Amino acid sequence: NNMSLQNAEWYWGDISREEVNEKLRDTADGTFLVRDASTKMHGDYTLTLRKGGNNKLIKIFHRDGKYGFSDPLTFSSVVELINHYRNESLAQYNPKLDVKLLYPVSKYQQ
């Protein structure tokens, strides 16, 4: 993790919901980025996803080197978790989030 995660184009580190909001403003369903959770109580990270004109916040929890949205946490890295849901609909997690992670908001000017 974290060498992988620090170089992920969609990983923005410590930035606020507010800054997250302007980056997803009027973007298509499936647009997303990952920041650090503002408090570890609420996971180590927050995935923000565009859906129905709305920014969904999905906590990424971490324990014993694994990552996930809920238990069991099966992923060996945040990147592998994201990569899975770029291929697969979030619907397997939540039926109200039937969209994939389609459009990374990139930190390398894109």
Q: Which domains does the chain have, with CATH numbers?
A: 1-110 (3.30.505.10)
Contact 82, 12 (CB under 8 A): no
Residue 106 and residue 91: Cα distance in Å, rounded?
Answer: 24
Residue 36 and residue 21: Cα distance in Å, rounded?
Answer: 15
* First CA to last CA distance, the chain: 23
Nearest to 51 by CA among 32, 75, 71, 79: 32
Question: This structure's resolution (angstroms)?
Answer: 1.9
Nearest to 103 by CA among 8, 1, 2, 27: 27
| DSSP three-state, residue 51 | strand
